[PDB]
């Protein structure tokens, strides 16, 4: 259940267009897409590591920059299962027994291990460990053999194959240091403490077997404009199921972007304004009103009023 | 003995002193003679509050009998460099350096109590030294004296001649008289 | 084995009358009811998040001022169960294991989890995590995936996915600062201190996920 | 050395000094020579307690033996400005500034002990220097002295001329006699 050698023409087209497809879904963060796409190309090309995973990447960046979106979309593009393991649950050393299973003679031995069973069932998949920093430091030791030896033994002695798995860990450890305001007459330097935090949080051996540490930069104003367009497209798909149609003026999109643009909160506030500004008014009309059937919604903004002007012509 | 005070938070209650707890609300407390160590502490509180919340305004309570001029320059320079607008409120009396720091506060927020006092006197340069040394040292006080008059003049807005005429000898100004002279903008309005 | 009201989308009479029914039961919280009603209407109108919960709401205000009455009445009107959990009990580091469940090889593994079992048994329900501020930071971390992903893996490995439930969290962080006046001679503008205090108490990741912070 | 009292809090009991524990009970012990640091400390306590409860008054036990008027005046200015009145319970020696500060208390809430004694006298400062400097000091010192007599007379309500005559020379007023004079409303019930 792994990609076949001597890649076919159809698969080749996907690999060259993967970067373009991912960039369209996730704007900005080009370096992250380049590291994931290049690693996959080498593995399929036959230049991948003999006994290590396809790629071990640590995505450290501010909130809402798409650290997990680039991984979720990658699985959809490649049509492989997304093995998403939340590391918030594994906050203590005792939780290690859940991933690798309980030792013989103890309760839960029969249940097995979630990580070992998941990888065995889906050899070729994207392993996403969200909030890796929040997990206990001891849990990181388990990943050492996975990143270097490519195998994790289970309670029963079964060894998993991680050669085709894409290990991607998202963390916001350095966000606190960078956002904090320095004290003193002269503003202190920035972006240096973030790297120091990862070194403190993760042991040298952990950072020594990582294919790369991609830093996700803060979303720019231009990027946010694209983000608003992406959210509007999702709303258009939901409305299409009901037959409703939505058209938004270019001026309205720019206005909405400025209202919700937030550097600290990234792209998530854009969804909130979209929900309040667009979804809430339509909700009443969609249930009972003109939008019940036909739709043909047109939305614009009045410069003098500085408020949205919705239109419903079924 | 500094009295202890308690605050409340979801996690629990922390024990802090009276000055620190009041310093958490951006209220500084200047008290006693101006010493180099004292000035270092005052400026430190300003730099800490600047980072905490620049939008808010600090409240430097200037109740002191004055002291070395050099120490005050650090407080005066710090009061201006920081983004917040320092509000200077006199409580009981304002001395030579106290008055200069009082007027240095941001215009529109300076306040004083009804029974507050103020005083401005020429700096004292009495010392014994070598003839050559006296001239060099004496030249310095003239520059600082003129410099001090010019700085207060800009904040007060009165012409340099007015300051020179009044500063010829010790002068005391009551709270109502202070607003008339222009040291402060208005009296402390009821909360 | 449910009231059959939720399965029928065409029965929109309840949603239009939800505000009126809730408003008569609770007085002085019309703003909160309006926000709560509108959020459920969009969720039932097909504009709900594909993987996130129906709505994440942080009820911040004074204690006893109509915060839990809207939650119990809402469940009856929507014909869904009410899951009430007291966060005062879950204030220690190891209390988190009670909800998610203890891992294999430790005591309590047989217990699936207080929160995971309840959501699995009742996928459609109202989760009332009262006194959220008291909860340990570890519990807050678990909620991040709930809003972002919608599923909490249990000790047994079963995915406790709950995207239909409406999450309401009661806190009293903001009421404290607004009630207490400033210190010092000159009064200070504390209109925005309540929001800043909430920002400090709650990590930005948690706040960003929340749909809206209701105010009482 | 000071005592260690274990107050009762929901999370856990916390040790506190006798001053701090009683400060929770709106008590502000004023004592010793009037000083800028001492005066600054006393006003800080009152401001902190105003946040706790604006309606409830803030007790004030004054045992000051007198001192610099400017340092003491700081408490007087803040007392009038704060919304909660101060119950000036005079249980000991009350000098000019001490008694003056005691009189500052709001009517209907002041107190005094019969055993104690309350004296009011003009401030005396032996300034020395050039004749011109002495004249300047004489102006301001008389001006502030008049200000003290005018503000003090305002609260009691007695004619300013009477107060000036009594303060011309050092005199002592018995605590029960003070009630008749108007310095305090009445002695402690029991
Ligand atoms: N760079 C981006 N481009 C486009 N949309 C984005 C981007 N970043 C975030 N979004 C939008 O925000 C949604 C949620 O982003 P997340 O995946 O939660 O971000 P994140 O930074 O990985 O979050 P953490 O892991 O909680 S810090 C995505 O599904 C998109 O709708
Ligand atoms: N604003 C309100 N409107 C209507 N009923 C209320 C209101 N506040 C309290 N109640 C009543 O208070 C009763 C007792 O419930 P409680 O749980 O003690 O209070 P509550 O306000 O519902 O919730 P909390 O947890 O105390 S904030 C409820 O059954 C309500 O009828
Ligand atoms: Mg995430």
Residue numbers in the entry:
A (entry chain D): 435 to 748
B (entry chain H): 2 to 192
C (entry chain E): 435 to 650
D (entry chain N): 2 to 191
The authors write:
ClpAP, a two-ring AAA+ protease, degrades N-end-rule proteins bound by the ClpS adaptor. AAA+ proteases, such as ClpAP, consist of a hexameric AAA+ unfoldase (for example, ClpA6) and a self-compartmentalized peptidase (for example, ClpP14). Each ClpA subunit has two AAA+ modules, called D1 and D2, that associate in the hexamer to form two stacked rings. Here we present high-resolution cryo-EM structures of Escherichia coli ClpAPS complexes, showing how ClpA pore loops interact with the ClpS N-terminal extension (NTE), which is normally intrinsically disordered.
Following single-particle cryo-EM analyses, three-dimensional (3D) classification and reconstruction using RELION-3 yielded six density maps (3.22–3.38 Å), representing three general structural classes (I, II and III), with the latter classes being subdivided into IIa/IIb/IIc or IIIa/IIIb subclasses. In two classes, the NTE is bound by a spiral of pore-1 and pore-2 loops in a manner similar to substrate-polypeptide binding by many AAA+ unfoldases. For example, density for the ClpS NTE was present in both the ClpA D1 and D2 rings in classes I and II, but only in the D1 ring of class III. In classes I and II, residues 2–15 of the ClpS NTE were built into density in the D2 portion of the channel, but this NTE region was not visible in class III, presumably as a consequence of its conformational heterogeneity. The register of this ClpS peptide is very similar in each structure, with the C-terminal portion of the NTE (Pro24–Pro25–Ser26) near the top of the ClpA channel, and the N-terminal portion near the bottom of the channel in classes I and II. In classes II and III, the relative height of ClpA subunits was A (highest) > B > C > D > E > F (lowest), whereas in class-I, subunit B was higher than subunit A, resulting in a shallower spiral when aligned to the bottom of the IGL loop and the two flanking ClpP subunits. Previous ClpAP structures and subclasses IIa and IIb show four or five engaged GYVG loops.
